[PDB]
Amino acid sequence: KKVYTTPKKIKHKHKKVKLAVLSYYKVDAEGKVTKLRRECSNPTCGAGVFLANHKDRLYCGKCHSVYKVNA
């Protein structure tokens, strides 16, 4: 046939990062637990799932993408 060429630079993949995440949740001196990161008002996501904090952005991940709640 021919075999191989390339101007170099191959592509990678994705990592899914690490993070021991959900410490986000503050409970006071025994034992009242208040929530950080506001949750989702889309009935497909029973207010368990949260909103990521970017710029302008507060976005619902479980809604694999859907809907822009901005506060």
Residues that bind RNA (CB under 7 A): 1-2, 5-22, 24, 37, 48-54, 57, 59-62, 64-66, 68
If one asks whether residue 58 binds Zn ion (CB under 5 A), the answer comes out as no
Q: In whole angstroms, what is the distance from residue 59 CA to residue 68 CA?
A: 6
Alpha-carbon distance values, 1 to 4, 5, 15, 21 (Å): 10, 13, 36, 51
Of 50, 51, 59, 60, the one binding Zn ion by CB under 5 A? 60
Least distance CB 5 / Zn ion (angstroms)? 46
Least distance CB 37 / Zn ion (angstroms)? 13
What letter does residue 50 receive in the DSSP assignment? B
CB-nearer residue toward RNA: 6 or 34: 6
What letter does residue 44 receive in the DSSP assignment? T
